[PDB]
Write a protein that binds this ligand. Structure first.
Ligand SMILES: COc1cc2c(Oc3ccc(NC(=O)C4(C(=O)Nc5ccc(F)cc5)CC4)cc3F)ccnc2cc1OCCCN1CCOCC1
Length: 286
């Protein structure tokens, strides 16, 4: 029962250009994919009559203008992302009654963190996943887009094992709650300057990317498990970094240390990371 007239008109216009008519979408409400504090994800079918399997993102409540606007804004930020390693938007379904729905292509293997924690990807496969993230990030950084929450939990994996960089945003699943701490920030993925200023850049996405490579090489271990969330800045400032994983090649560990350079301006670009990781990947048989 949303009132579009009370929302930002430029936002509503943007939503209308990617609109999905309520009749083209079948939402299977009994087929829940995920549940969170602010939103839920269901299986869906989008209709030449060809059926497209999709994921349908909804808000739990439609009473707050700020939450509704943020929800639509999240969907709109995605509309022009067109890259094999970035999650795309199928459209937004505005209904007469209930939450607007953000429609995403269905990702067979779910999120990358759950995938690597579950299958037996080789070390080359895991490095390949990192290279795919770096390509998706090289594309976003070229559009001057700052992610702010790069982590394996925000990367999706389709049926061809193609990694799609994404952000659950308001559809954040309840199991992910421990990784965010008081605004709720993903402190164990954040760069030192961002922990101190709460300001984000492509260079702070690079720090997060190094943490994501560590997640990959450990097959989804939680980073800094013995550090209290509010003490991470003190821990890092003692002169510490995540340790080299057993199956992490030395050149890949060196790349991680470069991603965590204390000076943001000295961290490698995503363009350099794609180049460096392509080379390391190529050394493995498969
Ligand atoms: C939780 O499980 C799943 C969630 C899925 C899904 O969820 C979302 C992901 C991202 C967004 N993002 C968004 O809503 C937004 C976004 O992504 N923006 C954005 C931001 C930055 C960027 F670079 C790109 C995109 C906020 C708009 C929204 C979603 F609803 C979308 C598609 N397929 C999914 C499949 C899932 O499991 C499949 C079943 C897996 N099983 C296999 C067998 O056993 C294991 C489990």
């Amino acid at each position: 029962h949303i009132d579009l007239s009370a929302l930002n008109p430029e936002l509503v216009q943007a939503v209308q250009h990617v609109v999905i008519g309520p009749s083209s979408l079948i939402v299977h409400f009994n087929e829940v994919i995920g549940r969170g504090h602010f939103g839920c994800v269901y299986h869906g079918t989008l209709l030449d009559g060809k059926k497209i399997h999709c994921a349908v993102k909804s808000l739990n409540r439609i009473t707050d203008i700020g939450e509704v606007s943020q929800f639509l804004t999240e969907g709109i930020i995605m509309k022009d992302f067109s890259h094999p390693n970035v999650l795309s938007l199928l459209g937004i379904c505005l209904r007469s009654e209930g939450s607007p729905l953000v429609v995403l292509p269905y990702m067979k293997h779910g999120d990358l963190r759950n995938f690597i924690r579950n299958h037996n990807p080789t070390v080359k496969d895991l490095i390949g996943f990192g290279l795919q993230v770096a390509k998706g990030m090289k594309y976003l950084a070229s559009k001057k887009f700052v992610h702010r929450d790069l982590a394996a939990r925000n990367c999706m994996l389709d049926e061809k094992f193609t990694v799609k960089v994404a952000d659950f945003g308001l559809a954040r699943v309840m199991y992910d709650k421990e990784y965010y701490s008081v605004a709720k920030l993903p402190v164990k993925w954040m760069a030192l300057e961002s922990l101190q200023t709460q300001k984000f850049t492509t260079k702070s996405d690079v720090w997060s990317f190094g943490v994501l490579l560590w997640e990959l090489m450990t097959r989804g271990a939680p980073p800094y498990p013995d550090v209290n969330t509010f003490d991470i800045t003190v821990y890092l400032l003692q002169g510490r970094r995540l340790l080299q994983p057993e199956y992490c090649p030395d050149p890949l560990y060196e790349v991680m240390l470069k991603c965590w350079h204390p000076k943001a301006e000295m961290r490698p670009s995503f363009s350099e990371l794609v180049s460096r990781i392509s080379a390391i990947f190529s050394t493995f048989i498969g």
